[PDB]
Structures are given as C-alpha cells and as structure tokens.
C-alpha cells in the first residue's frame, strides 16, 4: 500500500544519509 | 492519501539532510 | 487531519536539521 | 489524539537536534 | 495506547541524540 | 502489536545513533 | 504486515547511520 511505500522511501533516504556520513569520514581521512 | 503524502515529505526532507552532509564532506575535502 | 499535520511538522523539523548541517559546512569553510 | 501528540513530541525533539547542530557550527566558528 | 507510547520512546531517543550532539560541541570547544 | 514493536526497534536504533555520536565526542576529547 | 516490515527497514537504516557515525569517530581519532 501507499503508506508502506512511503515508509520504504523514508528507509531509502536514511540509507542515503548513512552514505553521506561515510563520505564525511572518508573526506576527513583525505 | 494525506498520510502517505506527509510521509513522502519526510523522505524528501531526509534527502535534504543527506545533501547537507555531502556539503560537510566537500568542506572537509577543501 | 491531525496525524498528517503532525507528520508535516516532522518534515519541517528535518528541513531545520538540514539547514543546521549546511551551517556546519559553512562554519568549517570559514 | 495521543498519536498526533506523540508525533508533535517527535517534531519538537528534531528541533532540539537542529539547535544542537547549530551549537556545533558555533563551536567550529570559535 | 502502545503506538503512542512507542512514538514517545522515539521522541525520548531523539532528545538523547540532541544531548550527544551537545557533547560533540563541548568536546570541540575543549 | 507488530507496529508498536517496530516503532520500539526504531527507538532502539536511535539510541545507537546517540551512542555513536558520544563516540565522536570522545574522539575530539 | 507491510507497514511493520517497512518500519523495520527504517530501524535497519538507522543502525546503518549509527555505523557510519562510528566511521567518522574513527576518522577524527586517526
């Protein structure tokens, strides 16, 4: 349903946040 | 529905957080 | 309805977090 | 409703996170 | 209700995140 | 109640985020 | 149900954020 689909979109966006945090860690190390 | 729409707005805001984190990564690289 | 409105308030608060992250990036850059 | 009230408490806590992030930006300045 | 109670626990956890971000700000200033 | 249980899992995951932020503060210290 | 499953996906994505923040802590220490 549409509520579950929207919640999956939230989960996808949170994974994008995780990735961006990894890019911060990598950037600091460089 | 309005609940699914509001959840999609939460997903969009989380994407904005990810992009802001990328700006921090880019700042650390400079 | 009140649930959808409250979810929109969460989305707004998340946009505030994105802005504060942009402030961190700017502060690091000088 | 109690669900909408609890969602509002989530939004208030997210604004606290935004403010704490602004404090990190102020620390970086500084 | 149990859903409202769980949502309150999420708000409490978000306040702990704000406090931890305070700790980062204070640690950077030290 | 599976929805309530999953929301409790969200709260637990958020507490893990708070702990990881304390680890960042400890790195600065 | 699918709503509960999507909420569990959100919890998993939050754990990924915690892991990424630990990568930042390790970077700051090094």
PDB file of C-alpha atoms in Angstrom:
ATOM      1  CA  UNK A   1       0.000   0.000   0.000  1.00  0.00           C
ATOM      2  CA  UNK A   2       0.872   3.724  -0.309  1.00  0.00           C
ATOM      3  CA  UNK A   3       1.753   4.133   3.420  1.00  0.00           C
ATOM      4  CA  UNK A   4       4.187   1.172   3.298  1.00  0.00           C
ATOM      5  CA  UNK A   5       5.664   2.529   0.000  1.00  0.00           C
ATOM      6  CA  UNK A   6       6.227   5.963   1.613  1.00  0.00           C
ATOM      7  CA  UNK A   7       7.863   4.314   4.645  1.00  0.00           C
ATOM      8  CA  UNK A   8      10.185   2.419   2.219  1.00  0.00           C
ATOM      9  CA  UNK A   9      11.073   5.828   0.662  1.00  0.00           C
ATOM     10  CA  UNK A  10      11.973   7.050   4.161  1.00  0.00           C
ATOM     11  CA  UNK A  11      14.217   3.984   4.644  1.00  0.00           C
ATOM     12  CA  UNK A  12      15.901   4.667   1.264  1.00  0.00           C
ATOM     13  CA  UNK A  13      16.541   8.315   2.252  1.00  0.00           C
ATOM     14  CA  UNK A  14      18.038   7.195   5.576  1.00  0.00           C
ATOM     15  CA  UNK A  15      20.459   4.925   3.649  1.00  0.00           C
ATOM     16  CA  UNK A  16      21.454   7.995   1.610  1.00  0.00           C
ATOM     17  CA  UNK A  17      22.210   9.768   4.926  1.00  0.00           C
ATOM     18  CA  UNK A  18      24.367   6.779   6.023  1.00  0.00           C
ATOM     19  CA  UNK A  19      26.303   7.016   2.747  1.00  0.00           C
ATOM     20  CA  UNK A  20      26.853  10.783   3.142  1.00  0.00           C
ATOM     21  CA  UNK A  21      28.199  10.154   6.658  1.00  0.00           C
ATOM     22  CA  UNK A  22      30.673   7.640   5.204  1.00  0.00           C
ATOM     23  CA  UNK A  23      31.711  10.354   2.685  1.00  0.00           C
ATOM     24  CA  UNK A  24      32.389  12.708   5.667  1.00  0.00           C
ATOM     25  CA  UNK A  25      34.593  10.046   7.292  1.00  0.00           C
ATOM     26  CA  UNK A  26      36.460   9.435   4.008  1.00  0.00           C
ATOM     27  CA  UNK A  27      36.877  13.222   3.373  1.00  0.00           C
ATOM     28  CA  UNK A  28      38.320  13.838   6.843  1.00  0.00           C
ATOM     29  CA  UNK A  29      40.840  10.964   6.264  1.00  0.00           C
ATOM     30  CA  UNK A  30      41.954  12.568   2.956  1.00  0.00           C
TER      31      UNK A  30
ATOM     32  CA  UNK B   1      -3.767   9.893   0.842  1.00  0.00           C
ATOM     33  CA  UNK B   2      -2.631  12.784   3.107  1.00  0.00           C
ATOM     34  CA  UNK B   3      -0.700  10.454   5.498  1.00  0.00           C
ATOM     35  CA  UNK B   4       1.287   8.882   2.592  1.00  0.00           C
ATOM     36  CA  UNK B   5       1.891  12.406   1.148  1.00  0.00           C
ATOM     37  CA  UNK B   6       3.238  13.671   4.503  1.00  0.00           C
ATOM     38  CA  UNK B   7       5.488  10.585   4.776  1.00  0.00           C
ATOM     39  CA  UNK B   8       6.842  11.391   1.290  1.00  0.00           C
ATOM     40  CA  UNK B   9       7.598  14.946   2.550  1.00  0.00           C
ATOM     41  CA  UNK B  10       9.557  13.360   5.422  1.00  0.00           C
ATOM     42  CA  UNK B  11      11.514  11.264   2.866  1.00  0.00           C
ATOM     43  CA  UNK B  12      12.264  14.426   0.827  1.00  0.00           C
ATOM     44  CA  UNK B  13      13.488  16.257   3.969  1.00  0.00           C
ATOM     45  CA  UNK B  14      15.762  13.277   4.795  1.00  0.00           C
ATOM     46  CA  UNK B  15      17.231  13.541   1.285  1.00  0.00           C
ATOM     47  CA  UNK B  16      17.936  17.233   2.054  1.00  0.00           C
ATOM     48  CA  UNK B  17      19.787  16.113   5.185  1.00  0.00           C
ATOM     49  CA  UNK B  18      21.889  13.726   3.058  1.00  0.00           C
ATOM     50  CA  UNK B  19      22.742  16.568   0.629  1.00  0.00           C
ATOM     51  CA  UNK B  20      23.703  18.864   3.558  1.00  0.00           C
ATOM     52  CA  UNK B  21      26.011  16.085   4.883  1.00  0.00           C
ATOM     53  CA  UNK B  22      27.595  15.938   1.471  1.00  0.00           C
ATOM     54  CA  UNK B  23      28.320  19.718   1.783  1.00  0.00           C
ATOM     55  CA  UNK B  24      30.148  18.934   5.069  1.00  0.00           C
ATOM     56  CA  UNK B  25      32.170  16.197   3.292  1.00  0.00           C
ATOM     57  CA  UNK B  26      33.054  18.658   0.476  1.00  0.00           C
ATOM     58  CA  UNK B  27      34.125  21.266   3.099  1.00  0.00           C
ATOM     59  CA  UNK B  28      36.419  18.717   4.796  1.00  0.00           C
ATOM     60  CA  UNK B  29      37.961  17.872   1.341  1.00  0.00           C
ATOM     61  CA  UNK B  30      38.793  21.587   0.853  1.00  0.00           C
TER      62      UNK B  30
ATOM     63  CA  UNK C   1      -6.174  15.525   9.583  1.00  0.00           C
ATOM     64  CA  UNK C   2      -4.090  15.926  12.763  1.00  0.00           C
ATOM     65  CA  UNK C   3      -1.810  12.876  12.025  1.00  0.00           C
ATOM     66  CA  UNK C   4      -0.908  14.211   8.558  1.00  0.00           C
ATOM     67  CA  UNK C   5      -0.361  17.708  10.069  1.00  0.00           C
ATOM     68  CA  UNK C   6       1.968  16.301  12.741  1.00  0.00           C
ATOM     69  CA  UNK C   7       3.905  14.386  10.070  1.00  0.00           C
ATOM     70  CA  UNK C   8       4.283  17.651   8.131  1.00  0.00           C
ATOM     71  CA  UNK C   9       5.707  19.250  11.330  1.00  0.00           C
ATOM     72  CA  UNK C  10       8.265  16.372  11.474  1.00  0.00           C
ATOM     73  CA  UNK C  11       9.192  17.083   7.816  1.00  0.00           C
ATOM     74  CA  UNK C  12       9.662  20.808   8.670  1.00  0.00           C
ATOM     75  CA  UNK C  13      11.875  19.925  11.675  1.00  0.00           C
ATOM     76  CA  UNK C  14      14.004  17.666   9.428  1.00  0.00           C
ATOM     77  CA  UNK C  15      14.454  20.580   6.975  1.00  0.00           C
ATOM     78  CA  UNK C  16      15.692  22.610  10.006  1.00  0.00           C
ATOM     79  CA  UNK C  17      18.247  19.868  10.706  1.00  0.00           C
ATOM     80  CA  UNK C  18      19.379  20.005   7.019  1.00  0.00           C
ATOM     81  CA  UNK C  19      19.839  23.806   7.345  1.00  0.00           C
ATOM     82  CA  UNK C  20      21.829  23.450  10.568  1.00  0.00           C
ATOM     83  CA  UNK C  21      24.099  20.917   8.748  1.00  0.00           C
ATOM     84  CA  UNK C  22      24.628  23.464   5.983  1.00  0.00           C
ATOM     85  CA  UNK C  23      25.658  25.951   8.754  1.00  0.00           C
ATOM     86  CA  UNK C  24      28.249  23.414   9.994  1.00  0.00           C
ATOM     87  CA  UNK C  25      29.674  23.086   6.461  1.00  0.00           C
ATOM     88  CA  UNK C  26      29.851  26.906   6.089  1.00  0.00           C
ATOM     89  CA  UNK C  27      31.449  27.358   9.543  1.00  0.00           C
ATOM     90  CA  UNK C  28      34.173  24.804   8.703  1.00  0.00           C
ATOM     91  CA  UNK C  29      34.932  26.673   5.398  1.00  0.00           C
ATOM     92  CA  UNK C  30      35.264  29.990   7.278  1.00  0.00           C
TER      93      UNK C  30
ATOM     94  CA  UNK D   1      -5.303  12.433  19.588  1.00  0.00           C
ATOM     95  CA  UNK D   2      -2.462  10.734  21.523  1.00  0.00           C
ATOM     96  CA  UNK D   3      -0.757   9.571  18.234  1.00  0.00           C
ATOM     97  CA  UNK D   4      -0.759  13.144  16.819  1.00  0.00           C
ATOM     98  CA  UNK D   5       0.508  14.478  20.203  1.00  0.00           C
ATOM     99  CA  UNK D   6       3.373  11.955  20.221  1.00  0.00           C
ATOM    100  CA  UNK D   7       4.243  12.879  16.625  1.00  0.00           C
ATOM    101  CA  UNK D   8       4.400  16.538  17.744  1.00  0.00           C
ATOM    102  CA  UNK D   9       6.823  15.471  20.526  1.00  0.00           C
ATOM    103  CA  UNK D  10       8.979  13.844  17.806  1.00  0.00           C
ATOM    104  CA  UNK D  11       8.950  17.101  15.812  1.00  0.00           C
ATOM    105  CA  UNK D  12       9.970  19.061  18.990  1.00  0.00           C
ATOM    106  CA  UNK D  13      12.856  16.622  19.632  1.00  0.00           C
ATOM    107  CA  UNK D  14      14.021  17.023  15.999  1.00  0.00           C
ATOM    108  CA  UNK D  15      14.090  20.836  16.531  1.00  0.00           C
ATOM    109  CA  UNK D  16      16.325  20.168  19.589  1.00  0.00           C
ATOM    110  CA  UNK D  17      18.661  18.206  17.293  1.00  0.00           C
ATOM    111  CA  UNK D  18      18.701  21.160  14.835  1.00  0.00           C
ATOM    112  CA  UNK D  19      19.660  23.507  17.687  1.00  0.00           C
ATOM    113  CA  UNK D  20      22.438  21.188  18.899  1.00  0.00           C
ATOM    114  CA  UNK D  21      23.812  21.124  15.321  1.00  0.00           C
ATOM    115  CA  UNK D  22      23.779  24.959  15.309  1.00  0.00           C
ATOM    116  CA  UNK D  23      25.835  24.768  18.532  1.00  0.00           C
ATOM    117  CA  UNK D  24      28.389  22.561  16.703  1.00  0.00           C
ATOM    118  CA  UNK D  25      28.538  25.184  13.899  1.00  0.00           C
ATOM    119  CA  UNK D  26      29.106  27.933  16.553  1.00  0.00           C
ATOM    120  CA  UNK D  27      31.888  25.744  18.091  1.00  0.00           C
ATOM    121  CA  UNK D  28      33.542  25.441  14.631  1.00  0.00           C
ATOM    122  CA  UNK D  29      33.413  29.276  14.212  1.00  0.00           C
ATOM    123  CA  UNK D  30      35.186  29.769  17.581  1.00  0.00           C
TER     124      UNK D  30
ATOM    125  CA  UNK E   1      -2.063   3.268  23.594  1.00  0.00           C
ATOM    126  CA  UNK E   2       1.022   1.167  22.657  1.00  0.00           C
ATOM    127  CA  UNK E   3       1.604   3.039  19.327  1.00  0.00           C
ATOM    128  CA  UNK E   4       1.577   6.442  21.089  1.00  0.00           C
ATOM    129  CA  UNK E   5       3.884   5.042  23.830  1.00  0.00           C
ATOM    130  CA  UNK E   6       6.365   3.754  21.211  1.00  0.00           C
ATOM    131  CA  UNK E   7       6.253   7.139  19.437  1.00  0.00           C
ATOM    132  CA  UNK E   8       7.077   8.792  22.810  1.00  0.00           C
ATOM    133  CA  UNK E   9      10.082   6.429  23.138  1.00  0.00           C
ATOM    134  CA  UNK E  10      11.229   7.626  19.685  1.00  0.00           C
ATOM    135  CA  UNK E  11      10.936  11.263  20.878  1.00  0.00           C
ATOM    136  CA  UNK E  12      12.987  10.414  24.003  1.00  0.00           C
ATOM    137  CA  UNK E  13      15.680   8.760  21.846  1.00  0.00           C
ATOM    138  CA  UNK E  14      15.818  11.840  19.603  1.00  0.00           C
ATOM    139  CA  UNK E  15      16.386  14.019  22.701  1.00  0.00           C
ATOM    140  CA  UNK E  16      19.330  11.699  23.577  1.00  0.00           C
ATOM    141  CA  UNK E  17      20.723  12.368  20.072  1.00  0.00           C
ATOM    142  CA  UNK E  18      20.405  16.147  20.706  1.00  0.00           C
ATOM    143  CA  UNK E  19      22.264  15.738  24.033  1.00  0.00           C
ATOM    144  CA  UNK E  20      25.030  13.732  22.329  1.00  0.00           C
ATOM    145  CA  UNK E  21      25.389  16.466  19.679  1.00  0.00           C
ATOM    146  CA  UNK E  22      25.789  18.980  22.677  1.00  0.00           C
ATOM    147  CA  UNK E  23      28.608  16.718  23.877  1.00  0.00           C
ATOM    148  CA  UNK E  24      30.321  16.938  20.441  1.00  0.00           C
ATOM    149  CA  UNK E  25      30.059  20.766  20.537  1.00  0.00           C
ATOM    150  CA  UNK E  26      31.503  20.892  24.060  1.00  0.00           C
ATOM    151  CA  UNK E  27      34.312  18.428  23.166  1.00  0.00           C
ATOM    152  CA  UNK E  28      35.329  20.508  20.116  1.00  0.00           C
ATOM    153  CA  UNK E  29      35.448  23.681  22.330  1.00  0.00           C
ATOM    154  CA  UNK E  30      37.744  21.833  24.796  1.00  0.00           C
TER     155      UNK E  30
ATOM    156  CA  UNK F   1       1.318  -5.335  18.376  1.00  0.00           C
ATOM    157  CA  UNK F   2       3.779  -5.565  15.447  1.00  0.00           C
ATOM    158  CA  UNK F   3       3.566  -1.815  14.559  1.00  0.00           C
ATOM    159  CA  UNK F   4       4.353  -0.798  18.174  1.00  0.00           C
ATOM    160  CA  UNK F   5       7.183  -3.386  18.282  1.00  0.00           C
ATOM    161  CA  UNK F   6       8.729  -1.995  15.061  1.00  0.00           C
ATOM    162  CA  UNK F   7       8.470   1.567  16.440  1.00  0.00           C
ATOM    163  CA  UNK F   8      10.320   0.341  19.578  1.00  0.00           C
ATOM    164  CA  UNK F   9      13.041  -1.035  17.230  1.00  0.00           C
ATOM    165  CA  UNK F  10      13.255   2.450  15.661  1.00  0.00           C
ATOM    166  CA  UNK F  11      13.705   3.987  19.145  1.00  0.00           C
ATOM    167  CA  UNK F  12      16.467   1.402  19.908  1.00  0.00           C
ATOM    168  CA  UNK F  13      18.264   2.235  16.633  1.00  0.00           C
ATOM    169  CA  UNK F  14      18.076   5.963  17.514  1.00  0.00           C
ATOM    170  CA  UNK F  15      19.731   5.211  20.875  1.00  0.00           C
ATOM    171  CA  UNK F  16      22.548   3.509  18.894  1.00  0.00           C
ATOM    172  CA  UNK F  17      22.926   6.745  16.894  1.00  0.00           C
ATOM    173  CA  UNK F  18      23.183   8.702  20.192  1.00  0.00           C
ATOM    174  CA  UNK F  19      25.935   6.303  21.359  1.00  0.00           C
ATOM    175  CA  UNK F  20      27.867   6.676  18.070  1.00  0.00           C
ATOM    176  CA  UNK F  21      27.664  10.484  18.488  1.00  0.00           C
ATOM    177  CA  UNK F  22      29.155  10.129  22.019  1.00  0.00           C
ATOM    178  CA  UNK F  23      31.981   8.108  20.346  1.00  0.00           C
ATOM    179  CA  UNK F  24      32.557  11.130  18.037  1.00  0.00           C
ATOM    180  CA  UNK F  25      32.692  13.463  21.092  1.00  0.00           C
ATOM    181  CA  UNK F  26      35.192  11.079  22.761  1.00  0.00           C
ATOM    182  CA  UNK F  27      37.351  11.230  19.571  1.00  0.00           C
ATOM    183  CA  UNK F  28      37.565  15.046  19.942  1.00  0.00           C
ATOM    184  CA  UNK F  29      38.433  14.668  23.677  1.00  0.00           C
TER     185      UNK F  29
ATOM    186  CA  UNK G   1       2.219  -6.772   7.882  1.00  0.00           C
ATOM    187  CA  UNK G   2       3.796  -4.490   5.233  1.00  0.00           C
ATOM    188  CA  UNK G   3       3.644  -1.332   7.474  1.00  0.00           C
ATOM    189  CA  UNK G   4       5.505  -3.142  10.294  1.00  0.00           C
ATOM    190  CA  UNK G   5       8.025  -4.530   7.746  1.00  0.00           C
ATOM    191  CA  UNK G   6       8.670  -1.034   6.343  1.00  0.00           C
ATOM    192  CA  UNK G   7       9.159   0.313   9.893  1.00  0.00           C
ATOM    193  CA  UNK G   8      11.722  -2.479  10.483  1.00  0.00           C
ATOM    194  CA  UNK G   9      13.531  -1.349   7.296  1.00  0.00           C
ATOM    195  CA  UNK G  10      13.627   2.175   8.794  1.00  0.00           C
ATOM    196  CA  UNK G  11      15.150   0.772  12.020  1.00  0.00           C
ATOM    197  CA  UNK G  12      17.790  -1.108   9.947  1.00  0.00           C
ATOM    198  CA  UNK G  13      18.665   2.079   8.018  1.00  0.00           C
ATOM    199  CA  UNK G  14      19.041   3.962  11.347  1.00  0.00           C
ATOM    200  CA  UNK G  15      21.507   1.276  12.502  1.00  0.00           C
ATOM    201  CA  UNK G  16      23.459   1.886   9.237  1.00  0.00           C
ATOM    202  CA  UNK G  17      23.588   5.604  10.209  1.00  0.00           C
ATOM    203  CA  UNK G  18      24.982   4.624  13.653  1.00  0.00           C
ATOM    204  CA  UNK G  19      27.690   2.537  11.951  1.00  0.00           C
ATOM    205  CA  UNK G  20      28.614   5.419   9.632  1.00  0.00           C
ATOM    206  CA  UNK G  21      28.896   7.771  12.621  1.00  0.00           C
ATOM    207  CA  UNK G  22      31.321   5.290  14.216  1.00  0.00           C
ATOM    208  CA  UNK G  23      33.401   5.522  10.967  1.00  0.00           C
ATOM    209  CA  UNK G  24      33.529   9.343  11.484  1.00  0.00           C
ATOM    210  CA  UNK G  25      34.626   8.882  15.133  1.00  0.00           C
ATOM    211  CA  UNK G  26      37.413   6.552  13.972  1.00  0.00           C
ATOM    212  CA  UNK G  27      38.483   9.110  11.309  1.00  0.00           C
ATOM    213  CA  UNK G  28      38.585  12.014  13.825  1.00  0.00           C
ATOM    214  CA  UNK G  29      40.732   9.817  16.191  1.00  0.00           C
ATOM    215  CA  UNK G  30      43.215   8.993  13.388  1.00  0.00           C
TER     216      UNK G  30
END
